[PDB]
């Protein structure tokens, strides 16, 4: 019901909400949103904080076979071109037993003041899924039907404004719109000339 919330000081730190946290090893799908945001007693073993590096470790002890942990690696750098502080989910990692998953997560960035939010941060790349595996025959797969994570500026134990993932335009649309709205200019140059080839009135 409530988000996961780690704290080290009297002040609160990194906090993470989802609506359906679900994972799969092989082809067995196990839903975990009932053991995470409702059970109120999580094994946050090392949940680091350093104001430039923060980790969120979730460990469940009842999963595919053995105790299986999930790692959310975040960073917080100063980018010179933007002149801001942009957080980024570095990688998200899972350690089952003597194995590391290494799910790469670009496009889960945003400015440090604001939080992230997306509707599908699932694996199993179809067109634009944000969690990509490092090697393509990957045994692990996970799926977030909702997602909201924040680090490095959590204040008063609640999320800030969300830097959303959707946007008005995607990079596949911007290439298809710069092509369609360019040969629309070629078409209305070639149609303006054929709209003005008027005939004669009389003959001799």
């Amino acid at each position: 019901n409530v988000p996961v919330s780690y704290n080290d000081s009297y002040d609160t730190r990194i906090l993470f909400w989802a609506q359906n946290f679900s994972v799969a090893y092989g082809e067995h799908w196990e839903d975990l949103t009932s053991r995470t945001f409702g059970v109120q007693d999580l094994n946050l073993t090392g949940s680091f904080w350093n104001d430039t590096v923060a980790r969120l470790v979730l460990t469940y002890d009842s999963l595919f076979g053995t105790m299986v942990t999930f790692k959310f690696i975040l960073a917080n750098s100063y980018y010179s071109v933007s002149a801001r502080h942009w957080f980024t989910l570095e990688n998200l990692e899972i350690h089952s037993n003597g194995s590391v998953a290494y799910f790469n997560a670009s496009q889960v960035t945003g400015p440090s003041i604001y939080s992230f939010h997306c509707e599908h941060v699932s694996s199993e790349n179809e067109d634009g899924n944000l969690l990509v595996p490092d090697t393509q025959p990957s045994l692990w797969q996970m799926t977030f039907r909702d997602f909201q994570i924040q680090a490095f500026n959590v204040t008063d134990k609640k999320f800030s404004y969300a830097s959303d993932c959707a946007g008005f335009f995607s990079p596949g649309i911007w290439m298809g719109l710069l092509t369609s709205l360019f040969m629309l200019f070629i078409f209305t140059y070639g149609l303006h000339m054929i709209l003005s080839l008027k005939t004669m009135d009389r003959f001799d």
Binding site: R84, S106, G167, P171
Partner: protein
């Protein structure tokens, strides 16, 4: 003006809507959502490379054919009464035909430099394949538009020289000097186009 009201009605409503949107991204701090970095790096460099080959030849033969029908209506229009024009005044046609020779040469010189790669990350796609993508766009634009302007320049002078040859047959060899200075503009676009793609290598 009937149809120019449509072209000015869209151009006003585009920039008035970018005036309102532009003073609503800054004003409630959403500047970070603009991301001209994300536009230039997530649009494929094969799009800029093939809008350079597509505009080197096609925008040259737009200006090569714009300069032919301007002066070719003055060959046949002025040569009804004086039919000695049609053999001496063909070098006006050739001077706007040669600006399409510079198009097809500089479209297959640029096309030899585009080669595929396999990367998808804007860090894996380094700033050599991005510089090679932008320099092929900016070399087919400076050889397509500079020959679109040169081809109409040697068509307007060639149409005036074909109507001065109709009155006095001795005048054509002296107005031929003006078409020499006009056809040197097209050669100046080829010099810049071979210097924009001199140190360009695309691929990995």
């Amino acid at each position: 003006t009937g149809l120019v009201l449509l072209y000015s009605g869209v151009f006003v409503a585009f920039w008035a809507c970018l005036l309102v949107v532009g003073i609503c991204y800054t004003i409630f701090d959403l500047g970070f959502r603009f991301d001209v970095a994300w536009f230039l790096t997530e649009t494929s460099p094969f799009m800029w490379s093939n809008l350079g080959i597509g505009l080197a030849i096609s925008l040259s033969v737009v200006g090569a054919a714009w300069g032919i029908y301007i002066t070719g209506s003055s060959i046949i229009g002025g040569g009804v009464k004086a039919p000695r024009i049609k053999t001496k005044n063909l070098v006006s046609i050739i001077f706007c035909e040669a600006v399409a020779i510079y198009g097809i040469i500089m479209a297959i010189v640029i096309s030899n430099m585009a080669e595929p790669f396999s990367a998808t990350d804007p860090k894996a796609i380094g700033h050599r394949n991005y510089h090679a993508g932008y320099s092929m766009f900016g070399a087919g634009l400076t050889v397509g538009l500079s020959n679109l302007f040169c081809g109409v320049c040697v068509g307007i002078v060639g149409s005036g020289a074909a109507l001065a040859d109709a009155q006095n047959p001795s005048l054509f060899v002296k107005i031929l000097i003006v078409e020499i200075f006009g056809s040197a503009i097209g050669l100046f676009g080829v010099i810049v186009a071979i210097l924009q793609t001199s140190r360009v290598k695309m691929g990995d």
